[PDB]
Design a protein around this ligand. Structure first.
Ligand SMILES: CC(C)(C)NC[C@H](O)COc1cccc2c1CC(C#N)=N2
Ligand SMILES: CC(C)(C)NC[C@H](O)COc1cccc2c1CC(C#N)=N2
Ligand SMILES: CCCCCCCCS[C@@H]1O[C@H](CO)[C@@H](O)[C@H](O)[C@H]1O
Ligand SMILES: CCCCCCCCS[C@@H]1O[C@H](CO)[C@@H](O)[C@H](O)[C@H]1O
Ligand SMILES: CCCCCCCCS[C@@H]1O[C@H](CO)[C@@H](O)[C@H](O)[C@H]1O
Ligand SMILES: CCCCCCCCS[C@@H]1O[C@H](CO)[C@@H](O)[C@H](O)[C@H]1O
Ligand SMILES: CCCCCCCCS[C@@H]1O[C@H](CO)[C@@H](O)[C@H](O)[C@H]1O
Ligand SMILES: CCCCCCCCS[C@@H]1O[C@H](CO)[C@@H](O)[C@H](O)[C@H]1O
Ligand SMILES: CCCCCCCCCC
Ligand code: NA
Ligand code: NA
Lengths: 276, 274
């Protein structure tokens, strides 16, 4: 009945993630004072955290509690597709956020005229399409599959939902969905910092964004590191820690609304909807 | 430059096809030219073979007759292949840089991991990724714009203009060209710093460098005016687009020339030519 306490903490995180990110989306929707361009990209980020609290983690919980997949081969693949799309769309969006800031800070005039809200939406949409293209389709086209006896065994057990991939796909996709967008964000972000210094409230906002980014990297990097190591030497790091780290990635989805508590704005808008 | 340019243009199809067919055959004869690096060179020559046999010949009928003569589907397949090949090339050049850099700083781990079977896997992974970001948005019509101008071009089968929306135009460019480019350069610069700090291998590295420089010089213009049409669609004249685009095609004819720098290819080109 260890199953019962697990369904309690699990149910609890789903609550954090879902409540916190609905609060964000609603606060920004409420105040137009809170409606800036930056916050448009933040909403995009919130939505990807929502999908996780609503779809990814719920089914993911059953998998960890029962050590087996109850939902069938098709939903297994679908679930996996969704999981990957959400992490790709996050880091891709954090990228945009950084580059957006770096442009506003260096080219303030050429920035205001070119950058409206209709375009940020067009940009958000393009990140989700790019994210769908590089991480949803391939999984749904079955390119991730291995040829190994053990792999084929898994693909035929509706109870097995191990993301057992071929090594080509393991490298290509971690680089393409995570590493590249990560490097880019790290670089562009560093630059924004130097610029902000060569300029010394706006900074508190810039710092919050850096924190959002830094926590993202800490929460997900262990998993993508372990991912590559595995490609080289399959039995050098224990399956359970593989799972531990992926859950650290999932938990990130609840840290954002928490971090936004640094703001007076977000602090006075968080308490208007919770009724105080 | 006008007599010169004119001759080159009357010779490109021949120059690209015969020259790349020739690179392929040389690498496949002289087992002394059979090395990991040269397998990537071969992938690079197939990208070029395809440009020489499918892309350029049909593009020639278009620029000359002034109209698309083959139907709207062949038009969208054509644009597809054209996008594929640029994408596969610059990705393959990326892999060639990373491969060399790694063969030069971790040579043991390099000799132990990198094999021919492995390299082939890497080639196909690259071609796969390339069809993904080039064929697939075309088959889902993600490239299409809403403008009546664009719309009349979609009805005219005799019109094969690649009129795309701004979202697509920027994204497909960042993804097919600029990112792979930025990586290839940062990596090639690292490899230069290593080959330097380290002093016939440097002659083979200098050719790889020339291949990567000429590729950049040949395509960067076309992608620059491509970002410019995004800002203002009237700010740059069609003729300048055609020229820059053909500058890039002509790139498919340069490589075999450049390899004549090596004595092995030269030797082997001459054997092959009776
Ligand atoms: C239960 C599973 C394993 C589905 N969790 C997936 C993880 O949340 C997201 O992991 C990934 C995200 C993007 C790209 C990826 C990736 C894993 C691999 C691999 N090879 N490539
Ligand atoms: C005649 C046409 C116009 C068909 N030539 C296409 C060009 O050779 C290939 O250009 C491209 C290569 C890769 C990615 C690209 C791209 C053009 C765009 C755009 N937007 N995205
Ligand atoms: C982010 C998307 C990454 C996609 C990577 C796809 C990799 C396929 S590898 C390789 O392809 C060959 C066919 O071309 C098959 O014959 C081999 O059996 C297979 O192992
Ligand atoms: C996306 C990139 C985000 C970059 C964020 C930079 C935030 C800088 S806060 C600033 O830092 C100074 C030291 O540099 C301190 O002395 C100040 O007291 C403090 O207010
Ligand atoms: C590997 C194929 C690359 C094709 C590039 C051009 C795609 C044009 S859209 C494509 O046109 C077909 C014919 O109309 C339809 O049958 C398909 O459903 C549709 O998606
Ligand atoms: C690597 C290339 C990425 C391109 C990403 C997708 C396009 C974002 S804009 C949008 O996409 C539609 C639906 O597909 C078109 O029908 C519309 O007219 C167009 O305005
Ligand atoms: C990364 C893609 C950015 C696209 C900006 C598009 C503005 C389109 S206005 C119609
Ligand atoms: C990515 C593969 C190509 C990286 C760049 C390779 C070519 C330059 S190496 C460089 O060439 C010089 C002459 O120009 C020599 O004098 C130096 O000793 C040597 O170190
Ligand atoms: C604009 C955000 C950058 C995401 C690029 C995706 C990487 C694919 C290139 C190989
Ligand atoms: Na299964
Ligand atoms: Na047409």
């Amino acid at each position: 009945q260890w199953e019962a306490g697990m369904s309690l903490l699990m149910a609890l995180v789903v609550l954090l993630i879902v409540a916190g990110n609905v609060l964000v989306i609603a606060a920004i929707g409420s105040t137009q004072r809170l409606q800036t361009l930056t916050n448009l990209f933040i909403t995009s980020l919130a939505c990807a955290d929502l999908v996780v609290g609503l779809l990814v983690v719920p089914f993911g919980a059953t998998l960890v509690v029962r050590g087996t997949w109850l939902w069938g081969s098709f939903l297994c693949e679908l679930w996996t597709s969704l999981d990957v799309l959400c992490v790709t769309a996050s880091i891709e969006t954090l990228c945009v956020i950084a580059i957006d800031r770096y442009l506003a800070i260096t080219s303030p005039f050429r920035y205001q005229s070119l950058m409206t809200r209709a375009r940020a939406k067009v940009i958000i949409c393009t990140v989700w399409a790019i994210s769908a293209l590089v991480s949803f389709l391939p999984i749904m086209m079955h390119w991730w599959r291995d040829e190994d006896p053990q792999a084929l065994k898994c693909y035929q057990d509706p109870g097995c939902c191990d993301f057992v991939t071929n090594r080509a796909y393991a490298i290509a996709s971690s680089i393409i969905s995570f590493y590249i967008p990560l490097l880019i964000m790290i670089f562009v972000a560093l630059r924004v910092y130097r610029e902000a210094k060569e300029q010394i409230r706006e900074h508190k906002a810039l710092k919050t964004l850096g924190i959002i980014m830094g926590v993202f990297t800490l929460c997900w990097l262990p998993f993508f590191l372990v991912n590559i190591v595995n490609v080289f030497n399959r039995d050098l790091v224990p399956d359970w820690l593989f799972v531990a780290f992926n859950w650290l990635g999932y938990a990130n989805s609840a840290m954002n609304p928490i971090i936004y508590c640094r703001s007076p704005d977000f602090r006075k808008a968080f308490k208007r909807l919770l009724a105080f």
